[PDB]
Design a protein around this motif. Structure first.
Motif, PDB file in Angstrom:
ATOM      1  N   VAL C 543     -88.174  65.474   5.578  1.00 48.48           N
ATOM      2  CA  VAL C 543     -86.847  65.884   6.015  1.00 48.48           C
ATOM      3  C   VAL C 543     -85.763  64.922   5.556  1.00 48.48           C
ATOM      4  O   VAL C 543     -84.584  65.288   5.554  1.00 48.48           O
ATOM      5  N   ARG C 544     -86.141  63.728   5.096  1.00 50.86           N
ATOM      6  CA  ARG C 544     -85.212  62.609   4.977  1.00 50.86           C
ATOM      7  C   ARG C 544     -84.062  62.871   4.011  1.00 50.86           C
ATOM      8  O   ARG C 544     -83.007  62.241   4.143  1.00 50.86           O
ATOM      9  N   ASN C 545     -84.228  63.794   3.070  1.00 46.92           N
ATOM     10  CA  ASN C 545     -83.218  64.070   2.047  1.00 46.92           C
ATOM     11  C   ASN C 545     -82.206  65.115   2.509  1.00 46.92           C
ATOM     12  O   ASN C 545     -81.956  66.107   1.828  1.00 46.92           O
ATOM     13  N   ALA C 546     -81.600  64.889   3.671  1.00 52.84           N
ATOM     14  CA  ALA C 546     -80.651  65.822   4.252  1.00 52.84           C
ATOM     15  C   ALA C 546     -79.276  65.182   4.315  1.00 52.84           C
ATOM     16  O   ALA C 546     -79.146  63.957   4.331  1.00 52.84           O
ATOM     17  N   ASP C 547     -78.242  66.020   4.336  1.00 50.17           N
ATOM     18  CA  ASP C 547     -76.932  65.525   4.734  1.00 50.17           C
ATOM     19  C   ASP C 547     -76.917  65.223   6.223  1.00 50.17           C
ATOM     20  O   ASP C 547     -76.544  64.123   6.645  1.00 50.17           O
ATOM     21  N   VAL C 548     -77.334  66.195   7.035  1.00 50.23           N
ATOM     22  CA  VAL C 548     -77.411  66.049   8.481  1.00 50.23           C
ATOM     23  C   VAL C 548     -78.740  66.627   8.964  1.00 50.23           C
ATOM     24  O   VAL C 548     -79.345  67.486   8.315  1.00 50.23           O
ATOM     25  N   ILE C 549     -79.195  66.141  10.115  1.00 46.54           N
ATOM     26  CA  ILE C 549     -80.483  66.503  10.696  1.00 46.54           C
ATOM     27  C   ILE C 549     -80.255  66.892  12.154  1.00 46.54           C
ATOM     28  O   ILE C 549     -79.528  66.205  12.877  1.00 46.54           O
ATOM     29  N   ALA C 550     -80.854  68.001  12.583  1.00 45.67           N
ATOM     30  CA  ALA C 550     -80.595  68.551  13.906  1.00 45.67           C
ATOM     31  C   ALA C 550     -81.893  68.843  14.641  1.00 45.67           C
ATOM     32  O   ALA C 550     -82.868  69.296  14.038  1.00 45.67           O
ATOM     33  N   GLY C 551     -81.884  68.596  15.955  1.00 43.77           N
ATOM     34  CA  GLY C 551     -82.956  69.005  16.832  1.00 43.77           C
ATOM     35  C   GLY C 551     -82.441  69.950  17.907  1.00 43.77           C
ATOM     36  O   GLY C 551     -81.232  70.170  18.045  1.00 43.77           O
ATOM     37  N   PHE C 552     -83.382  70.508  18.672  1.00 47.52           N
ATOM     38  CA  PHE C 552     -83.061  71.437  19.747  1.00 47.52           C
ATOM     39  C   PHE C 552     -83.822  71.089  21.017  1.00 47.52           C
ATOM     40  O   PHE C 552     -84.962  70.622  20.979  1.00 47.52           O
ATOM     41  N   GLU C 553     -83.154  71.315  22.143  1.00 48.25           N
ATOM     42  CA  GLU C 553     -83.773  71.366  23.466  1.00 48.25           C
ATOM     43  C   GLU C 553     -83.085  72.529  24.176  1.00 48.25           C
ATOM     44  O   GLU C 553     -81.978  72.380  24.706  1.00 48.25           O
ATOM     45  N   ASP C 554     -83.729  73.693  24.126  1.00 47.71           N
ATOM     46  CA  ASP C 554     -83.219  74.937  24.703  1.00 47.71           C
ATOM     47  C   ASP C 554     -81.950  75.424  23.996  1.00 47.71           C
ATOM     48  O   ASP C 554     -80.913  75.662  24.618  1.00 47.71           O
ATOM     49  N   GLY C 555     -82.043  75.559  22.671  1.00 45.62           N
ATOM     50  CA  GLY C 555     -81.189  76.441  21.899  1.00 45.62           C
ATOM     51  C   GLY C 555     -79.771  75.988  21.651  1.00 45.62           C
ATOM     52  O   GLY C 555     -79.040  76.689  20.945  1.00 45.62           O
ATOM     53  N   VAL C 556     -79.347  74.863  22.214  1.00 44.90           N
ATOM     54  CA  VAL C 556     -78.003  74.336  22.014  1.00 44.90           C
ATOM     55  C   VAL C 556     -78.071  73.200  21.006  1.00 44.90           C
ATOM     56  O   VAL C 556     -79.113  72.579  20.800  1.00 44.90           O
ATOM     57  N   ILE C 557     -76.946  72.912  20.361  1.00 44.22           N
ATOM     58  CA  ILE C 557     -76.902  71.733  19.505  1.00 44.22           C
ATOM     59  C   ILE C 557     -77.094  70.516  20.405  1.00 44.22           C
ATOM     60  O   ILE C 557     -76.193  70.140  21.160  1.00 44.22           O
ATOM     61  N   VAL C 558     -78.275  69.904  20.350  1.00 43.49           N
ATOM     62  CA  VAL C 558     -78.613  68.805  21.243  1.00 43.49           C
ATOM     63  C   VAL C 558     -78.539  67.456  20.541  1.00 43.49           C
ATOM     64  O   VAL C 558     -78.165  66.460  21.162  1.00 43.49           O
ATOM     65  N   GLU C 559     -78.889  67.392  19.258  1.00 44.84           N
ATOM     66  CA  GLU C 559     -78.912  66.120  18.536  1.00 44.84           C
ATOM     67  C   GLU C 559     -78.541  66.388  17.088  1.00 44.84           C
ATOM     68  O   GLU C 559     -79.287  67.067  16.378  1.00 44.84           O
ATOM     69  N   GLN C 560     -77.411  65.843  16.650  1.00 48.75           N
ATOM     70  CA  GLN C 560     -76.926  66.069  15.296  1.00 48.75           C
ATOM     71  C   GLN C 560     -76.606  64.750  14.610  1.00 48.75           C
ATOM     72  O   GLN C 560     -75.952  63.877  15.190  1.00 48.75           O
ATOM     73  N   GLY C 561     -77.068  64.615  13.376  1.00 56.43           N
ATOM     74  CA  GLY C 561     -76.795  63.422  12.608  1.00 56.43           C
ATOM     75  C   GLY C 561     -77.713  63.326  11.407  1.00 56.43           C
ATOM     76  O   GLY C 561     -78.546  64.190  11.165  1.00 56.43           O
ATOM     77  N   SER C 562     -77.511  62.256  10.649  1.00 52.67           N
ATOM     78  CA  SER C 562     -78.341  61.911   9.507  1.00 52.67           C
ATOM     79  C   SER C 562     -79.465  60.990   9.979  1.00 52.67           C
ATOM     80  O   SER C 562     -79.773  60.923  11.169  1.00 52.67           O
ATOM     81  N   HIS C 563     -80.124  60.305   9.045  1.00 51.27           N
ATOM     82  CA  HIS C 563     -81.308  59.527   9.394  1.00 51.27           C
ATOM     83  C   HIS C 563     -80.981  58.456  10.430  1.00 51.27           C
ATOM     84  O   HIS C 563     -81.444  58.517  11.576  1.00 51.27           O
ATOM     85  N   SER C 564     -80.156  57.475  10.054  1.00 49.70           N
ATOM     86  CA  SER C 564     -79.881  56.361  10.962  1.00 49.70           C
ATOM     87  C   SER C 564     -78.968  56.775  12.110  1.00 49.70           C
ATOM     88  O   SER C 564     -78.962  56.123  13.160  1.00 49.70           O
ATOM     89  N   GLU C 565     -78.192  57.846  11.930  1.00 51.63           N
ATOM     90  CA  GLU C 565     -77.295  58.289  12.989  1.00 51.63           C
ATOM     91  C   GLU C 565     -78.077  58.832  14.175  1.00 51.63           C
ATOM     92  O   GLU C 565     -77.621  58.736  15.318  1.00 51.63           O
ATOM     93  N   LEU C 566     -79.256  59.390  13.931  1.00 52.63           N
ATOM     94  CA  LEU C 566     -80.108  59.838  15.023  1.00 52.63           C
ATOM     95  C   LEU C 566     -81.176  58.819  15.392  1.00 52.63           C
ATOM     96  O   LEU C 566     -81.631  58.815  16.542  1.00 52.63           O
ATOM     97  N   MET C 567     -81.589  57.957  14.449  1.00 56.79           N
ATOM     98  CA  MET C 567     -82.655  56.998  14.733  1.00 56.79           C
ATOM     99  C   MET C 567     -82.340  56.132  15.946  1.00 56.79           C
ATOM    100  O   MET C 567     -83.259  55.630  16.603  1.00 56.79           O
ATOM    101  N   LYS C 568     -81.056  55.942  16.253  1.00 53.86           N
ATOM    102  CA  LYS C 568     -80.622  55.245  17.459  1.00 53.86           C
ATOM    103  C   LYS C 568     -79.889  56.168  18.432  1.00 53.86           C
ATOM    104  O   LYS C 568     -79.198  55.677  19.332  1.00 53.86           O
ATOM    105  N   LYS C 569     -80.019  57.488  18.276  1.00 55.44           N
ATOM    106  CA  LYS C 569     -79.252  58.438  19.074  1.00 55.44           C
ATOM    107  C   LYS C 569     -80.041  59.019  20.244  1.00 55.44           C
ATOM    108  O   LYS C 569     -79.439  59.637  21.127  1.00 55.44           O
TER     109      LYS C 569
END
Ligand SMILES: CCCCC/C=C\C/C=C\CCCCCCCC(=O)OC[C@H](COP(=O)([O-])OCC[N+](C)(C)C)OC(=O)CCCCCCC/C=C\C/C=C/CCCCC
Ligand SMILES: CC[C@@H]([C@H](C)O)n1ncn(-c2ccc(N3CCN(c4ccc(OC[C@@H]5CO[C@@](Cn6cncn6)(c6ccc(F)cc6F)C5)cc4)CC3)cc2)c1=O
Ligand SMILES: CC(C)CCC[C@@H](C)[C@H]1CC[C@H]2[C@@H]3CC=C4C[C@@H](O)CC[C@]4(C)[C@H]3CC[C@]12C
Ligand SMILES: CC(C)CCC[C@@H](C)[C@H]1CC[C@H]2[C@@H]3CC=C4C[C@@H](O)CC[C@]4(C)[C@H]3CC[C@]12C
Ligand SMILES: CC(C)CCC[C@@H](C)[C@H]1CC[C@H]2[C@@H]3CC=C4C[C@@H](O)CC[C@]4(C)[C@H]3CC[C@]12C
Ligand SMILES: CC(C)CCC[C@@H](C)[C@H]1CC[C@H]2[C@@H]3CC=C4C[C@@H](O)CC[C@]4(C)[C@H]3CC[C@]12C
Ligand SMILES: CC(C)CCC[C@@H](C)[C@H]1CC[C@H]2[C@@H]3CC=C4C[C@@H](O)CC[C@]4(C)[C@H]3CC[C@]12C
Ligand SMILES: CC(C)CCC[C@@H](C)[C@H]1CC[C@H]2[C@@H]3CC=C4C[C@@H](O)CC[C@]4(C)[C@H]3CC[C@]12C
Lengths: 211, 234, 1140
Positions: C543-569
């Motif tokens: 996944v690492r070659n992304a502009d931004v990376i997103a996860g979900f917890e019940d269908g809402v934008i829960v976690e948005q960012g790039s590698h290091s922006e989420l690694m501490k998020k």
């Protein structure tokens, strides 16, 4: 519904009129068959209904009917023959293959030579013996033999085996195994074995001493 | 294709046992012709056993087996079973399947069930009815007697004894010589075991120089044996 | 109403078919008019001077009549033929247009509509219902019109030719009307009662065949078979009633019918003695009203069939006129042509109509700049593939908005919207064509340079230069001749020959090696230059070659960012980081009951009576003509009184014998139906779990097997025997008399009988040939339609319905030509049939005039012979077509005779196998290699070893269905391993008595069921072969912690948990399973996911109960709750069917 291949175990030579009679029960009425089987391997179908061949089968084999005297006859005898033929009959939910015949090749009467050997002292410990006073390279098959322990008519203590006729010069051999338990082979000294064959001008007499 | 009947099952039971012998045909439809079950005696003769036709549902057994054996014919996979119950000691024979003949070529009618013969067969599975199990065949070398025919044709061998089940291989000069060697077929011993004797003919001219072994190899008892041959001396 | 889809040529066809229907129908009554006149001349000349030895006037008149007869014959020939063809031609054409428009509007039908209904319902609907309409509107209408014609013509020729007698006859009609009408009400009500009672006793087979597995484990064959017999022995009590009632009524109908004969004959004997209505004009009214009656009687089902036609056509027309939400075919769409790759979301809520009791969308707020790649992650159970499906609008969300550059999602012409984007999904399926053609279907019109360049660039060219017929190999049904990773690469070749503006990538790299994944990754990377690509996360290492990376917890934008922006998020991403049917005989279907032979004997003696009743009426009629020659009134009228009585004596005897034949065979049939029902069920239950796990032997089809095919076998067993017996009498003494009397007329008419008879036989032969060829062509096109009813979502994705429409048509045109051949084949023999009924009159009577003149046989004898044979054959026809369809119940018997003998490899009844006395639960696996021979392509277990000790535990951690249920089975010995051995207690489980082995293995499967019994009856199902003490129940009722809540219920151990028992929760019916497994005192457990409805306490209490007696005895557990896995004795993982 009983069947009798009457001339069991024929003895004809290569190049001759060869006959088989397979007299039936009452009125199978042309519904008999003829099977030739080479040993160990499945039986073939030769001819059916007592007249008409199967496929792939050579046209030297004759089937003949008469009332209930049937007949399967030959004159060619390519050596691919020499097996046992069974003439099954099939009628009303009851099918019987009768006890068939065989065909033995011809040769001069082969002198039978006897050999007797007292059981190995390696053997006597286990409590039995199995002494063998067999024969070798004799022709025909019919050989009568006599075990005679301490000059007695030994009967019921003989189980003789015989190989199938030799392929090259067509003679036979024989193995007869007289067994005796421990309580027996210790009290008799001279063990005499006799044979009776037409190849022998005199039915001979094998023997030994218990030492 | 070409008509190909195979068998299955079978291989061991004692008196009072069940078994299932499955004859699977290949090359034709099953329900078009009759199916029999011949039984070849071990050395004596050839006796019918049964049949079944799965297109008129008609079965039929010979007497000696009635009520005990049951045929069936599964036409979902071209198979003909024979289920056996309460086997005696007069049923150690081998059991070929077979297909009875048709004249028209592609089916057989009820009239004259199998009165034109049986054409295709399989190769028989051998079955047995012995008690206990199998043991080791302790050989007792048939040492040539010291009364051997001086410069004659001398007999000698060894008796491989009490062995089961068939077969066993008996070789001479350890697979380098079997001339004059006759492997007398397996004869049966009263209590149920067997005995075969393998003998060879020799001149007494070489009895001093050459000395041999009868070589036994009893595979289903997981054992291979030797025992040297020697002209027996008092 | 129903004939919409009609050009003009159809209407011309139908109308020029109807008028000639009527002008055929009117063809017998005219025939009887001429018969009247001719018998008048004959008997006049005969009595006025009999000449056994100036008579040639007889010949002049008889040739005149022969011209009339045959000229009339020609008339019916032409009209018959035209009726048949034109009606069936209008049928064929209209049905082909129907089929075509129905598909083209099933493709236009949305996915919500597909989420609602079934996908075999549709295809079966297509095949059957279109055949239903075809036979409905087809030709039955022609025959119905000729029926009404012959009716009104019969009554009119009556009133026109003598009115007193016609009134006498037509007067007593309303009594036969009342009679047969109450016949109908009786028999119909009884059929209803019988069927309702059965189907009340056949929901048992459907609730113990929808759950074959739990049964075949717990050892519940015989409990079931007896739950079945106990119900068939209720239904017999009503079977018998219906037998006696229907057959009394049938006998009544014949008593009345023969009573009518007597009345009319005696009246119209007084009215002929008076010299008023001469025999010629007296026989005319008789026979014409007879023919009126027989025709109009024997054409009722040609109304039930039209009713079936309408009944089908309702839903089909309901669909073709149906018109959905956003149309996959309307070019009405504001499609832009130049646009960025902007994808902006907001507060989109979307639920499923098929599943609305779980919120799946909860408001997403994401932005996608043009070209910038966002990569989506998330755990198991949120709806990624769902979201993809949304993005392309296969649905419509509730209260949110998506846009491209703010432009509405209700703007994009759907062809544009799903031809502009591309998606590779979990399992992008391959259709039944080439490689080049799948790729062409990628876009529709491409270049070979694009072809090889994608193919190569798609990482997937080597096997092409390896594959047999390199360029054009056939990837058949669901990609069996492939590797795994080739299929995603070829999907990517397809999707890349598309050149999309938005790309979607889902689980397409699950069974690849890393390198090919990386290739296609960089390929789509070097393809994205101004567009976006969204990818669902399998392994978070790429996944690492992304502009931004997103996860979900019940269908809402829960976690948005790039590698290091989420690694501490610290959201979710962080925690995610680390058919032969062998024909049967007749003899066999019969041997199926040689234990009711007394009934067959009574019934067939009785039948032969009933059926040798015409040669009577032939000789009776002969005698009637015989008495009317000389003319001495006094003794005539007494003879005629005698003959009215004889008819009366035959009216009574007919009643008895009809009622016997009917009732006797009703008994034999009912019995055999009960026996075949029972035997077949009991044989179903004794089959290994493969046979049931087929797509052919489903629960629908098996339940149909029981509920109709058992019934149908009786047709071929009993009725066909009665019917052969009847017709032998009906037409054996026919020819026997007619040879004692006509030495030479008999032969001549026997030389025509086969035509009137073998209309049906020649049609069966040739119609069967063409029906085979048809059904084959229909099955071709059915294949082509099964495709896009299975692989629907993909095909609408590629938007390539419209290619399937034409592909379908190309085959549809097969069966239409089939029909146009069937027209002519059917019609020419139908017309020779109806045509040849007249030419027989002509020949026979002209020849009889020849003889009578020369002096070979009195006119009473030519009328005998002719009636005995011709009305013989015409009666044979109707008899036969009263039977039930023997072609359709000699196959039914085949379909039960294949279910009977089929020997399962794992016999669940066998009384053999090593029984172990006391059992130490030491379970062991030896590199067990496994695969379901259903989808036999993925080896589920690839060599597996497991070993547990007495009292100990195993536990297999991992992912959902990874190869974790199959272990649960290979011990219950449902299936057998492809390779591997599971030797138990030290010994090999391929040698135990299977009936014994499953008697130690208590199981709480993933979804426990509660049968249609009371609870006491239900748990104590936990053991069979020995009845359960009521306290045994109660003991386990305290064991699994369930005895209390029972004391709340109405009937503590006696309440009814119904079919599925909707009176219950998930945590209680799951809890009962523990109650259930424990009465057996089972050695080893297999507690497969007992807590998916178990609450905290419900489980947290019972685990104490699960294990306490589990102490001293093993258990495998394959669940999902770590807090049970931890305390377990042992540990194993399963990765793609492998441990590590
Ligand atoms: C000739 C005098 C005319 C008498 C008129 C007779 C009937 C018409 C009377 C009033 C008109 C009523 C309209 C009827 C509407 C439909 C009812 C009907 O009527 O239904 C025809 C009848 C039954 O119809 P189905 O097909 O459903 O029967 C199967 C029956 N269930 C289904 C129960 C098994 O038909 C049958 O079965 C049985 C018919 C018995 C025929 C026996 C054949 C003997 C042939 C010739 C002997 C003639 C001698 C005359 C001598 C003349 C002297 C010059
Ligand atoms: C329920 C259990 C079941 C068991 C278990 O099987 N079961 N139990 C009992 N039955 C059963 C038993 C018997 C029947 N039948 C019904 C049919 N029958 C019949 C007899 C004579 C007929 O006509 C005599 C000639 C024919 O031609 C006519 C009339 N006509 C012409 N076209 C049409 N009709 C004619 C022609 C041309 C002309 F120019 C003038 C004419 F007059 C005069 C017609 C029909 C009697 C037998 C049905 C069912 C069962 O099936
Ligand atoms: C295959 C189909 C069309 C059969 C054709 C048969 C027709 C054409 C045949 C059948 C028997 C023939 C009739 C039989 C009786 C005679 C009487 C004779 O004095 C004049 C000819 C005449 C009137 C014949 C006319 C033609 C006829 C009706
Ligand atoms: C349903 C009805 C109206 C069909 C029409 C019937 C026609 C085809 C029948 C009825 C009357 C018949 C005609 C009546 C008179 C004769 C005289 C004869 O010596 C030659 C044939 C001829 C000319 C007949 C030919 C056939 C005919 C025209
Ligand atoms: C329900 C309707 C539409 C059926 C039509 C029936 C018509 C076409 C039939 C019924 C009865 C027939 C008539 C019956 C009686 C007469 C008088 C007779 O001396 C010769 C035949 C003749 C002239 C017929 C002509 C055709 C006719 C009127
Ligand atoms: C509704 C049903 C039962 C009506 C049946 C009509 C029967 C019962 C009646 C109605 C008119 C009657 C006819 C009227 C006139 C006479 C003259 C008389 O000297 C003898 C009987 C005779 C010839 C009758 C025969 C029976 C008859 C046809
Ligand atoms: C619809 C049905 C039930 C009508 C009832 C049948 C009646 C009308 C029939 C049945 C048999 C007939 C009777 C049979 C016998 C007798 C006596 C005889 O010497 C002359 C005719 C006569 C007087 C008949 C009158 C009409 C009759 C009674
Ligand atoms: C198709 C079938 C049912 C009808 C065939 C009609 C044939 C068989 C019949 C119809 C009329 C009959 C002919 C009519 C006239 C005569 C002239 C006479 O001096 C001898 C018999 C003879 C020669 C008949 C012989 C047979 C005949 C031609």
């Amino acid at each position: 519904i009983q069947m009798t291949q009457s001339p069991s175990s024929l003895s004809a030579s290569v190049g001759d009129r060869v006959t088989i009679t397979c007299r039936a029960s009452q009125s199978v009425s042309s519904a008999v068959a003829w099977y030739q089987q080479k040993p160990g391997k499945a039986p073939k179908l030769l001819i059916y209904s007592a007249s008409s061949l199967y496929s792939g089968v050579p046209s030297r084999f004759s089937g003949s009917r008469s009332g209930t005297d049937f007949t399967l006859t030959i004159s060619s005898l390519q050596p691919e023959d020499f097996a046992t033929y069974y003439c099954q009959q099939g009628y009303s939910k009851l099918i019987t293959f009768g006890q068939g015949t065989k065909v033995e090749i011809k040769r001069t009467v082969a002198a039978p030579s006897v050999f007797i050997f007292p059981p190995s002292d390696s053997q006597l410990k286990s409590g039995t013996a199995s002494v063998v006073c067999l024969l070798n390279n004799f022709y025909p098959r019919e050989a009568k033999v006599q075990w005679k322990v301490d000059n007695a008519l030994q009967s019921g203590n003989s189980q003789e085996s015989v190989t199938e006729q030799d392929s090259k010069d067509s003679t036979y051999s024989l193995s007869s195994t007289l067994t005796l338990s421990k309580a027996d082979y210790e009290k008799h000294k001279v063990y005499a074995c006799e044979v009776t064959h037409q190849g022998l001008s005199s039915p001979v007499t094998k023997s030994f001493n218990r030492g | 294709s070409e008509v190909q009947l195979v068998e299955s099952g079978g291989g061991l039971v004692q008196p009072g046992g069940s078994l299932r012998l499955s004859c699977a045909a290949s090359g034709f439809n099953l329900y078009s012709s009759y199916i029999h079950w011949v039984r070849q005696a071990p050395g004596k003769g050839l006796e019918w056993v049964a049949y079944i036709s799965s297109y008129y549902g008609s079965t039929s057994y010979a007497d000696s087996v009635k009520g005990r054996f049951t045929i069936s014919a599964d036409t979902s996979k071209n198979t003909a079973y024979l289920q056996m119950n309460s086997l005696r000691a007069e049923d150690t024979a081998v059991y070929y399947c077979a297909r009875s003949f048709s004249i028209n070529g592609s089916y057989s009618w009820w009239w004259d069930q199998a009165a034109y013969g049986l054409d295709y067969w399989g190769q028989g599975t051998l079955v047995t009815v012995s008690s206990a199990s199998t043991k080791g065949p302790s050989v007792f070398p048939l040492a040539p007697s010291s009364k051997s025919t001086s410069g004659g044709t001398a007999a000698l061998g060894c008796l491989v004894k009490d062995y089961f089940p068939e077969p066993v291989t008996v070789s001479w000069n350890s697979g380098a010589l079997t001339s004059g060697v006759h492997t007398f077929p397996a004869v049966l011993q009263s209590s149920g075991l067997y005995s075969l004797s393998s003998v060879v003919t020799v001149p007494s001219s070489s009895l001093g120089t050459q000395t041999y072994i009868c070589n036994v190899n009893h595979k289903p008892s997981n054992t291979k044996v030797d025992k040297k041959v020697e002209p027996k001396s008092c | 109403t129903l004939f919409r889809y009609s050009d003009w040529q159809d209407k011309l066809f139908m109308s020029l078919g109807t008028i000639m229907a009527i002008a055929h129908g009117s063809g017998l009554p005219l025939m009887m008019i001429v018969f009247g006149e001719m018998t008048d001349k004959f008997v006049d000349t005969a009595g006025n001077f009999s000449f056994p030895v100036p008579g040639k006037i007889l010949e002049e008149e008889m040739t005149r009549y022969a011209y009339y007869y045959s000229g009339l014959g020609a008339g019916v020939l032409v009209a018959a033929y035209i009726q048949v063809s034109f009606w069936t031609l209008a049928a064929g054409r209209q049905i082909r247009k129907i089929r075509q428009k129905f598909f083209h509007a099933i493709l236009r039908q949305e996915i919500g509509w597909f989420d609602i209904n079934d996908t075999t319902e549709l295809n079966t609907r297509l095949t059957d219902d279109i055949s239903k309409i075809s036979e409905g509107i087809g030709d039955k209408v022609g025959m119905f019109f000729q029926a009404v014609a012959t009716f009104f013509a019969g009554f009119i020729v009556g009133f026109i030719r003598g009115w007193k007698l016609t009134l006498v006859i037509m007067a007593i009609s309303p009594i036969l009307g009342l009679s047969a009408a109450v016949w109908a009400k009786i028999l119909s009500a009884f059929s209803d009662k019988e069927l309702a009672a059965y189907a009340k006793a056949g929901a048992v087979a459907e609730e113990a065949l929808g759950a074959i597995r739990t049964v075949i484990a717990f050892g519940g064959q015989n409990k079931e078979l007896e739950r079945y017999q106990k119900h068939l022995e209720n239904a017999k009590e009503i079977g018998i009633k219906k037998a006696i009632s229907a057959n009394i009524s049938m006998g009544i109908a014949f008593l009345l019918i023969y009573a009518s004969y007597a009345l009319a004959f005696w009246y119209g004997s007084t009215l002929v003695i008076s010299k008023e209505y001469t025999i010629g004009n007296a026989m005319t009214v008789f026979f014409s009203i007879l023919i009126g009656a027989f025709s109009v009687g024997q054409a009722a089902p040609c109304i039930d069939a039209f009713a079936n036609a309408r009944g089908a056509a309702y839903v089909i027309f309901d669909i073709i006129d149906n018109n959905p939400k956003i149309d996959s075919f309307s070019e009405r769409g504001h499609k832009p042509d130049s646009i960025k790759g902007n994808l902006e979301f907001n507060d989109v809520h979307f639920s499923y109509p098929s599943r609305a009791n779980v919120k799946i969308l909860k408001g997403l707020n994401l932005k996608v700049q043009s070209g910038q790649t966002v990569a989506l992650v998330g755990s198991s159970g949120c709806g990624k593939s769902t979201t993809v499906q949304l993005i392309q609008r296969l649905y419509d969300p509730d209260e949110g908005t998506i846009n491209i550059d703010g432009q509405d999602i209700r703007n994009f012409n759907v062809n544009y919207l799903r031809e502009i984007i591309g998606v590779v999904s979990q399992e992008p399926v391959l259709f039944s064509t080439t490689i080049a053609e799948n790729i062409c279907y990628g876009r529709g019109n491409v270049t070979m340079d694009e072809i090889k360049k994608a193919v190569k660039e798609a990482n997937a060219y080597e096997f092409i230069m390896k594959l047999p017929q390199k360029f054009d190999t056939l990837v058949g049904e669901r990609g069996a001749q492939l590797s795994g990773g080739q299929k995603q690469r070829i999907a990517i070749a397809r999707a890349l020959v598309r050149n999309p503006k938005i790309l979607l990538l889902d689980q397409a790299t699950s069974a690849l090696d890393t390198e090919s994944e990386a290739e296609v990754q960089a390929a789509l990377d070097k393809a994205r230059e101004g567009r976006t690509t969204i990818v669902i996360a399998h392994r978070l290492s790429t996944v690492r070659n992304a502009d931004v990376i997103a996860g979900f917890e019940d269908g809402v934008i829960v976690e948005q960012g790039s590698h290091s922006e989420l690694m501490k998020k610290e959201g979710v991403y962080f925690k995610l980081v680390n058919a032969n049917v062998p024909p049967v005989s007749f003899l066999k279907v019969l041997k199926l009951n040689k234990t009711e032979w007394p009934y067959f004997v009574v019934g067939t003696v009785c039948a032969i009576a009933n059926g040798g009743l015409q040669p009577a009426f032939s000789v009776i009629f002969s005698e009637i003509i015989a008495i009317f020659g000389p003319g001495d009134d006094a003794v005539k009228q007494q003879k005629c009184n005698i003959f009215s009585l004889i008819f009366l004596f035959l009216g009574i005897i007919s009643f008895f014998t009809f009622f016997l034949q009917g009732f006797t065979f009703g008994k034999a049939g009912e019995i055999l139906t009960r026996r075949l029902r029972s035997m077949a069920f009991k044989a179903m239950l004794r089959q290994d779990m493969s046979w049931f796990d087929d797509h052919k032997n489903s629960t629908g089809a098996l339940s149909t097997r029981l509920a109709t095919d058992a019934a149908q076998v009786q047709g071929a067993t009993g009725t066909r025997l009665a019917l052969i017996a009847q017709n032998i009498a009906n037409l054996g003494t026919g020819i026997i008399i007619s040879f004692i009397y006509g030495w030479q007329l008999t032969l001549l008419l026997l030389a025509v009988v086969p035509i009137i008879a073998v209309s049906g036989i020649v049609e069966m032969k040739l119609l069967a040939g063409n029906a085979k060829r048809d059904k084959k062509e229909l099955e071709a096109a059915g294949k082509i339609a099964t495709e896009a009813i299975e692989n629907i979502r993909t095909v609408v994705s590629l938007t390539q319905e419209r290619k399937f429409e034409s592909m379908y048509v190309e085959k549809l045109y097969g069966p239409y030509r089939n029909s146009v051949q069937k027209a002519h084949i059917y019609g020419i023999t139908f017309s020779i049939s109806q045509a040849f009924m007249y030419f027989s009159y002509a020949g026979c009577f002209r020849f009889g005039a020849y003889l009578i003149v020369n002096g070979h046989m009195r006119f009473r004898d030519v009328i005998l012979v002719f009636s005995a044979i011709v009305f013989g054959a015409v009666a044979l026809g109707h008899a036969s077509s009263f039977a039930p369809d023997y072609a359709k119940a000699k196959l039914s018997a085949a379909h039960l005779f294949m279910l009977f003998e089929r020997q399962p490899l794992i016999d669940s009844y066998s009384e053999e196998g090593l029984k172990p006395d006391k059992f130490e639960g030491n379970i062991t696996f030896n590199e067990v290699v496994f695969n379901y021979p259903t989808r036999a392509n993925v080896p589920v277990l690839q060599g597996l070893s497991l070993e547990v000790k007495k009292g100990q535990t195993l536990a297999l951690v991992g992912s959902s269905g990874c190869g974790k249920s199959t272990v649960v089975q290979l011990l219950e010995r449902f299936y057998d391993p492809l390779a591997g051995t599971v030797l138990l207690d030290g010994q090999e489980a391929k040698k135990l008595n299977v009936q014994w082995l499953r008697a130690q293995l208590g199981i709480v499967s993933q979804e426990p069921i509660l049968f249609d019994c009371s609870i006491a009856e239900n748990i104590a199902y936990g053991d069979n072969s020995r009845v359960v003490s009521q306290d045994e129940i109660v003991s386990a009722a305290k064991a699994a912690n369930i005895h209390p809540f029972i004391e709340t219920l109405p009937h503590k151990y006696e309440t009814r948990v119904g079919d599925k028992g909707t009176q219950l929760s998930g945590g209680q019916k799951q809890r009962i399973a523990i109650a259930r497994a424990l009465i057996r005192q089972p050695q080893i457990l297999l507690l497969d996911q007992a807590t998916s409805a178990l609450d905290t306490e419900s489980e947290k209490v019972v685990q104490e109960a699960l294990d306490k007696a589990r102490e001293g005895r093993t258990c495998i557990v394959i669940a999902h709750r770590l807090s049970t896995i931890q305390n377990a004795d042992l540990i194993v993982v399963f990765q793609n069917g492998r441990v590590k």
